[PDB]
């Protein structure tokens, strides 16, 4: 029967499932694309005039009240006095630029610094008298006198916007409000200051802060846990939504990029600095050989290298994801007992310390167990072909395990392995060799190998689980 090691792989491959024909939390479950469409329901966007396919938008930080601040009721209904005006502080301006950068990273927009004043296509400013919310912005379908404007609440009762920083609510709010100015809405028909909106009023299940920064609702609603942290940058569904409007940015991080620990992203939200770092990000990456490095964590982690998939990283749940259309090649686990699932291409998987379960998937994968009793799992024959097999780079006999219990020939076929020196034309015959080693199995029974695994360090029959 199927081993527990295989079961854990299969369960995490289908973890945080979306789509499907059943109601989730009393809502229909949406795919990433369906969620993106709903986010863009207002059909609001900036029109490309200087050049198509690439948009250029200027931004500035107001130094004095504008015409809208002075008399809001002349322009908008149900907004009267915004209180005291204050310019964006030095910290606010630097964090706004990082929020702006995180948007331009993922889509074809170039943000130009227009300095201090009312110059920019997008403007930023603080207000003190709340209109039911912590901040507000206008979508780009409004008249020119309001287009691009975002406003943020600062008073003695609300201080979240005063000191924005990586992982806090002040930063997310900035990313959220700029999202509005670019043309994104809340994933549901709800608004702060209007009645009593809850997660029950969402249009779809994946309307949480695990999938979109435009959402009001906490990640716990869809089974995630960020332990108090907020996403600083666009999440899975945000990326899909904004790319529908202004395209995918295929110039971003085209070289070999490391995410998590030892990061070369130069992005605070993509980077881990200590064993306590609370990571929340969705990877947008245009090309190259890329690595998820979570070696500095001690907790038991679950890492999924497939696109659109969510991972459990550094004591958090469903906090790391990979954007649609992104290929990430490599994963490095921490000192805890980790689960590492690869994707369709060639993957380098490193477990590190602890008892790790590695699943290369399709392609010829380089699998490092590290210290401890590690399990290398196979669910399909095509995952390690005789012509292009996996390599187990640090296999230790009597400690590590080759798991084949999930294979169709064992679960349903009822096949028993016969270890031999030559294939006589029988199903299940296996040749185990050593010099460096190799395991080659003839599952069909045509005297030719259809499944193989390359070995660095010898393996025995006892190291193979069926």
């Amino acid at each position: 029967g199927r081993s527990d090691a295989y079961t854990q792989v299969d369960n995490f491959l289908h973890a945080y499932a979306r789509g499907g024909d059943e109601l989730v939390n009393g809502h229909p479950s949406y795919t990433v694309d369906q969620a993106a469409e709903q986010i863009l329901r207002e059909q609001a966007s900036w029109q490309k005039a200087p050049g198509d396919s690439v948009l250029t938008l200027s931004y500035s930080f107001l130094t004095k009240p504008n015409d809208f601040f002075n008399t809001p009721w002349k322009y908008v209904s149900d907004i009267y006095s915004l209180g005291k005006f204050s310019a964006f502080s030095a910290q606010q301006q630097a964090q706004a630029k990082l929020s702006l950068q995180s948007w331009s990273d993922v889509t074809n927009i170039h943000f130009v610094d227009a300095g201090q004043g009312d110059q920019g296509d997008l403007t930023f400013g603080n207000f003190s008298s709340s209109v039911g919310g912590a901040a507000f912005a206008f979508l780009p379908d409004v008249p020119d006198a309001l287009k691009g404007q975002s406003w943020y609440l600062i008073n003695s009762s609300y201080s979240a916007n005063v000191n924005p920083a990586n992982g806090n609510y002040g930063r997310q709010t900035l990313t959220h409000e700029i999202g509005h100015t670019l043309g994104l809405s809340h994933p549901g028909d709800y608004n702060a200051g209007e009645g009593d909106p809850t997660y029950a009023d969402a249009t779809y299940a994946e309307d949480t802060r695990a999938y979109s920064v435009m959402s009001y609702w906490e990640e716990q609603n869809t089974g995630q846990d960020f332990k108090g942290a907020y996403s600083s940058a666009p999440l899975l569904d945000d990326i899909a939504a904004i790319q529908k409007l202004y395209g995918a940015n295929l110039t971003t991080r085209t070289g070999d990029t490391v995410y998590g620990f030892n990061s070369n992203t130069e992005r605070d939200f993509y980077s881990a600095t200590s064993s306590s770092s609370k990571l929340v990000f969705s990877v947008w990456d245009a090309g190259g050989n890329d690595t998820l490095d979570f070696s500095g964590f001690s907790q038991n982690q679950k890492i999924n290298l497939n696109e659109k998939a969510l991972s459990d990283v550094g004591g958090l749940k469903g906090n790391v994801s990979i954007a649609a259309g992104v290929t990430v090649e490599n994963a490095i686990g921490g000192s805890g007992s980790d689960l590492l699932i690869g994707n369709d291409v060639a993957n380098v998987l490193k477990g590190g310390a602890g008892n790790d379960i590695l699943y290369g998937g399709l392609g010829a994968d380089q699998l490092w167990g590290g210290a401890g009793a590690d399990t290398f799992v196979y669910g399909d024959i095509a995952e390690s072909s005789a012509a292009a097999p996996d390599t187990l780079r640090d296999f230790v006999s009597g400690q590590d395990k080759i798991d084949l219990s999930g294979l169709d020939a064992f679960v349903n076929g009822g096949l028993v392995l016969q270890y031999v020196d030559a294939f006589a034309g029988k199903a299940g015959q296996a040749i185990l060799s050593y010099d460096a080693g190799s395991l080659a199995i003839d599952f069909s029974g045509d005297a030719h190998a259809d499944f193989a695994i390359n070995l660095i360090g010898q393996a025995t029959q006892a190291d193979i689980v069926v």
């Binding site: 322009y75 919310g133 901040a135 809340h186």
Partner: peptide, 6 residues
Amino acid sequence: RPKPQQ
């Protein structure tokens, strides 16, 4: 006429 945040 705008779109507040929670």
